[PDB]
Amino acid sequence: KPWWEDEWEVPRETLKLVERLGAGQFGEVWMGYYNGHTKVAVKSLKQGSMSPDAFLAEANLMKQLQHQRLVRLYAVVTQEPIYIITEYMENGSLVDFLKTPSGIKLTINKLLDMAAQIAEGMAFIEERNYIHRDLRAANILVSDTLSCKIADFGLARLIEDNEYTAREGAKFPIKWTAPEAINYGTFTIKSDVWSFGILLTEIVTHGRIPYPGMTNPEVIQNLERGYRMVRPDNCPEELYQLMRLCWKERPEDRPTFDYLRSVLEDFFTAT
Ligand SMILES: COc1cc(Nc2nn3c(NCC(C)(C)N)cc(C4CC4)nc3c2C(N)=O)cc(OC)c1
């Protein structure tokens, strides 16, 4: 729809950027207020860094993925400077929050609770026929009630045949990304499952880098021998075996997010 009929377009004055949370090559992230009283996050595009259509495509993907377990789209401003406005999460990214005094005091039980919540959200994405493509703790946000939501949907894609294929020069984070997407550019929901397995380690280690002590080429080589990540410190053997399911050789042998979600709630109500 044209901006004048767009239910998502808002006039810029309704917004007040208060605190800049982050800044980078492509824009800034602010805490702000909508119409005075409502805390919101505001993503703003650095003019010239990328096309506005490229930027705005994030807000169009989010429009299609509405669910309590995913970060909710709020509005857009489509005249420069371009804004994407969303649900505000007070405890920031999962990987940062796990390092704070609060985060450190969390039981394994609450940790498993959060794992289940993230899996619950990926269960919704999966059934909507989407993939995320960048699932990892840095892309999980935390609420003021220690709730978890999936975020950063820029790489998300609609699957009509469960397989999106990236450019031949496209690069992705090697430690978080399934072999087949690394090797062939082929992304399925089962690639997200492999990444979720990696995510489970960050959770149990409070935001530590996966495959401790290893370079990217070492990870590739070890994985190709049939090894997987060494058991993290303070990681229940049950969870580790759920990680191993996530990291199976054949994409199709890895579990659905619905299964992972059901298992982790069992783990959690058992602790
Ligand atoms: C990073 O530092 C902080 C960020 C935030 N908030 C946020 N960062 N953040 C992103 N940042 C990028 C990410 C961290 C998710 N990779 C990406 C997205 C996508 C657009 C929904 N949303 C957000 C929010 C949000 N919706 O609240 C809050 C903090 O409070 C202490 C600290």
UniProtKB/Swiss-Prot annotation:
It is an enzyme of class 2 (transferase). Changing residue 164 to F: Abolishes autophosphorylation. It is found in: Cell membrane; Cytoplasm, Cytosol. ATP binds at residues 21-29, 43. This is Tyrosine-protein kinase Lck. Belongs to the protein kinase superfamily. Tyr protein kinase family. SRC subfamily. Signal peptide: none annotated. There is a cross-link at residue 46 (Glycyl lysine isopeptide (Lys-Gly) (interchain with G-Cter in ubiquitin)). Non-receptor tyrosine-protein kinase that plays an essential role in the selection and maturation of developing T-cells in the thymus and in the function of mature T-cells. Plays a key role in T-cell antigen receptor (TCR)-linked signal transduction pathways. Constitutively associated with the cytoplasmic portions of the CD4 and CD8 surface receptors. GO terms for cellular component: cell-cell junction; cytoplasm; cytosol; extracellular exosome; immunological synapse; membrane raft; pericentriolar material; plasma membrane. Its EC number is 2.7.10.2. Keywords: ATP-binding, Cell membrane, Chromosomal rearrangement, Cytoplasm, Disease variant, Host-virus interaction, Isopeptide bond, Kinase, Lipoprotein, Membrane, Myristate, Nucleotide-binding, Palmitate, Phosphoprotein, Proto-oncogene, SH2 domain, SH3 domain, Transferase, Tyrosine-protein kinase, Ubl conjugation.
